[PDB]
A paper describes a structure:
MCPH1 plays important roles in DDR upon induction of double-strand breaks (DSBs). It contains two BRCA1 C-terminus (BRCT) domains at its C-terminus that mediate its interaction with the DNA damage marker γ-H2AX. The shelterin components TRF1 and the TRF2-RAP1 heterodimer specifically recognize double stranded telomeric repeats, while POT1 binds the single stranded (ss) 3’ overhang. A previous report showed that MCPH1 interacts with the TRF Homology (TRFH) domain of TRF2 and localizes at dysfunctional telomeres.
Analysis of the human MCPH1 amino acid sequence revealed the presence of a 330YRLSP334 sequence typical of the TRFH-binding motif (TBM) Y/F/H-X-L-X-P (where X is any amino acid) found in proteins that interact with TRF2, including Apollo/hSNM1B, PNUTS, SLX4, and NBS142–45. To understand the structural basis of this interaction, we solved the crystal structure of TRF2TRFH–MCPH1TBM complex at a resolution of 2.15 Å by molecular replacement. As predicted, the binding mode of MCPH1TBM to TRF2TRFH closely resembles the interaction between ApolloTBM and TRF2TRFH 43. MCPH1TBM binds to TRF2TRFH in an extended conformation with a short helix at the N-terminus across the concave face of each TRF2 subunit, and involves an extensive set of interactions, including both Van der Waals contacts and electrostatic polar interactions. The most critical interaction interface is the central portion of MCPH1TBM (330YRLSP334). MCPH1Y330 fits into a hydrophobic cleft formed by the aliphatic side chain of TRF2L101 and TRF2R102, and the hydroxyl group of MCPH1Y330 forms two hydrogen bonds with TRF2S98 and TRF2E94. MCPH1L332 is completely buried in a deep pocket surrounded by hydrophobic residues from α2 and α3 of TRF2, and MCPH1P334 stacks with the aromatic ring of TRF2F120. The backbone carbonyl of MCPH1R331 forms a hydrogen bond with TRF2R109. Isothermal titration calorimetry (ITC) confirmed the MCPH1TBM–TRF2TRFH interaction with an equilibrium dissociation constant (KD) of 0.24 μM. Mutating any one of the three conserved residues in the TRFH-interacting motif (Y330, L332, or P334) either completely abolished this interaction or greatly reduced it, confirming the importance of these hydrophobic contacts in  mediating the MCPH1TBM–TRF2TRFH interaction.
Residue numbers in the entry:
A (entry chain C): 322 to 337
B (entry chain A): 47 to 122, 126 to 185, 187 to 244
The structure:
Amino acid sequence: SQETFEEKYRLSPTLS
Amino acid sequence: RLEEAVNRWVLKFYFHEALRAFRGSRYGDFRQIRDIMQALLVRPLGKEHTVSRLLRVMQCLSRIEEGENLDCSFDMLTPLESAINVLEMIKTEFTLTEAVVESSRKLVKEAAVIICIKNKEFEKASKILKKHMSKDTTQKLRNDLLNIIREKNLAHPVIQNFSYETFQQKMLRFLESHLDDAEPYLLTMAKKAL
């Protein structure tokens, strides 16, 4: 739906 | 049209260098290269099937490489729990059998509990053991890990002998086995240029 390519395949952690 | 091609060349080259760094235990370099790949993901890369496989492998490795940092999240879940989710996605999208990924699923789940125990996060270890190991592995290991948690017994051999280096090198070995062998176009051209 609204999922982006960057979201689906996120490599780096959202919170670090 | 042209940017997509170069973008894929660039992604594939940096994927190659990330594996090389991970395989050499150069995790500082791995993370720097990972951040470059992350920044590339917002640019047009072509048909999603041309890059899906390498990206899933890179996702799993990135979560494993952060596996000991419980102060880090890829999903609003500890890093090794995220890696478990990516492993399931790899099983489905790579058309693998349950048996082929079983031993790897086992390594990641055991690592997820043991890292929590090593950091003395007994409650997190207990919740992970119940979430991922209840419906898969053996009851004696579940019981052993439970009792290690109840007694906070980091001296137990299951904890003492666990090696994170060995764990993540084994994980790279399994993940790599599903990738094609083509050397990245950029690396080839660099050899010819130098």
